[PDB]
Design a protein around this ligand. Structure first.
Ligand SMILES: *[C@@H]1O[C@H](CO)[C@@H](O[C@@H]2O[C@H](CO)[C@@H](O)[C@H](O)[C@H]2NC(C)=O)[C@H](O)[C@H]1NC(C)=O
Ligand SMILES: *[C@@H]1O[C@H](CO)[C@@H](O)[C@H](O)[C@H]1NC(C)=O
Ligand SMILES: *[C@@H]1O[C@H](CO)[C@@H](O)[C@H](O)[C@H]1NC(C)=O
Ligand SMILES: *[C@@H]1O[C@H](CO)[C@@H](O)[C@H](O)[C@H]1NC(C)=O
Lengths: 196, 49, 17, 49, 49, 49
């Protein structure tokens, strides 16, 4: 597909809830018309956006001309959070180039809803446990209770259990691999005998 | 045994000698090998012993 | 499990200014 | 978990090739894997954990 | 003889700056633990029109 | 005019390593008012041992 004029973003797959970061919104032109844009994005409660180059309005970008701006943004919620950024051409402001007709389709404006990841603020860290309960003809039970809310932030507390027998993760290779001829001295001979 | 360098590097060891015949001696400041990466076939450094 | 820590440990000793 | 030998041999050692020191790091645990394990009647939780 | 034509969305020519590192390898250093194997790498720059 | 020339050089270009060899040092004076020079052959045996 294509678009002679749109806006592209530049932002990671993920951020952290804690620290701030610029979101850089780049706008590109290829059709011969050279037109200013009102590129922007609604500030929605799952974050905080702040531009740096609004008051100086853009001038124009022409065919194979592109501009870019910033938003010193920081998230507030956690998870995938849409970034709906909207931009459109303009008319009768012929200050940058010769003319600015600016009559594209009903879809003349590229409004782009995009969900990016965040992790909760701060140095994360883990915690681990385990067990075994093998009644070979009867019953067993057990409990495990789990609390570390000293000096944390909410609900990044999360965990996940496991259920299995753990015996075959290496069973194939070493077994079939390791059968060999006897040769060598008594030392080598035992070395290759005994494993078998 | 162990000693160190004086202002001129000079050292004066001495030895109690109630022993068998053929002695043979040495001292080092590094261990008995070209400690950093001596086995490569392309090693260019040493210390005298 | 996992979780997040270090919201503390910003104290004010003398520290020679 | 596991064990080593004491995590480094204190004297000057190593350099490469495990010379006179094959690092023997597993069999120490293997017999431990017997150690916790084997007894007369049958085993428990903690051993097997 | 060198060049670059770094494609883009739709294979367009896209502007910017570029630099490149031709890299011969594995020179006279011992390459081991104090020695970078990286041999003569000329770095050549361009401005992407 | 008074005193003499100074230049405390860098030596990275040599790669004072295995297979680049003994340092020969030959200095050449384009003196004034003659077009005359000669050179001194000195310090040529600087073994980087
Ligand atoms: C925010 O982004 C999410 C995706 O992370 C959007 O959820 C999608 O909503 C559309 C319809 O609006 C569904 O067809 C999709 O199935 C939803 N996501 C998926 C992958 O299933 C959401 O609409 C965006 N905006 C809001 C307000 O949540
Ligand atoms: C050598 O011996 C002295 C005591 O005579 C001791 O204090 C010192 O630690 C020894 N040298 C080293 C390398 O430890
Ligand atoms: C050196 O040590 C030996 C140990 O038997 C001793 O006999 C001898 O007297 C010592 N040398 C001296 C102190 O002269
Ligand atoms: C290499 O590029 C040059 C232009 O700099 C050109 O003249 C030549 O034909 C190209 N091919 C070569 C020299 O191998």
């Amino acid at each position: 597909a294509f678009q002679p004029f749109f806006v592209e973003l530049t932002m990671p797959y993920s951020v952290i809830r804690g620290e701030a970061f610029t979101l850089k919104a780049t706008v590109l032109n290829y059709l011969p018309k050279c037109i200013r844009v009102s590129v922007q994005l609604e500030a929605s409660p799952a974050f905080l956006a702040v531009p740096v180059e609004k008051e100086q309005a853009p001038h124009c970008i022409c065919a194979n001309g592109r501009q870019t701006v910033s938003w010193a943004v920081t998230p507030k919620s956690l998870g995938n959070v849409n970034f709906t950024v909207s931009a459109e051409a303009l008319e009768s402001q012929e200050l940058c180039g010769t003319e600015v007709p600016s009559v594209p389709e009903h879809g003349r404006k590229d409004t782009v809803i995009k969900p990016l990841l965040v992790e909760p603020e701060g140095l994360e860290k883990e915690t681990t446990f385990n067990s075994l309960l093998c009644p070979s003809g009867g019953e067993v039970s057990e409990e495990l209770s789990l609390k570390l809310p000293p000096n944390v932030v909410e609900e990044s507390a999360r965990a996940s259990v496991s259920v299995l027998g753990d015996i075959l993760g290496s069973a194939m290779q070493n077994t079939q691999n390791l059968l060999q001829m006897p040769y060598g001295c008594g030392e080598q001979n035992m070395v290759l005998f005994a494993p078998n | 045994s162990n000693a160190t360098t004086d202002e001129h590097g000079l050292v004066q060891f001495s030895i109690n000698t109630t022993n068998v015949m053929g002695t043979s001696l040495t001292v080092r400041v590094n261990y008995k090998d070209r400690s950093p990466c001596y086995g490569y076939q392309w090693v260019s450094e040493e210390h005298e012993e | 499990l996992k979780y997040n820590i270090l919201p503390e440990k910003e104290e004010f000793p003398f520290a020679l200014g | 978990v596991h064990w080593e030998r004491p995590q480094k041999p204190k004297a000057p050692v190593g350099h490469f090739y495990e010379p006179q020191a094959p690092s023997a790091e597993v069999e120490m645990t293997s017999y431990v894997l017997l150690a916790y394990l084997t007894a007369q009647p049958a085993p428990t939780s903690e051993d097997l954990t | 003889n060198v060049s670059v034509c770094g494609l883009y969305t739709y294979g367009k020519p896209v502007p910017g700056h570029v630099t490149v590192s031709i890299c011969r390898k594995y020179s006279d250093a011992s390459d081991c633990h104090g020695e970078d194997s990286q041999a003569f790498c000329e770095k050549f720059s361009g401005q992407l029109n | 005019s008074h005193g003499c020339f100074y230049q405390q050089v860098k030596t990275k270009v040599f790669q004072l390593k295995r297979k680049e060899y003994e340092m020969k040092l030959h200095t050449e004076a384009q003196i004034q008012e003659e077009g005359t020079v000669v050179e001194l052959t000195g310090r040529q045996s600087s073994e980087i041992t």
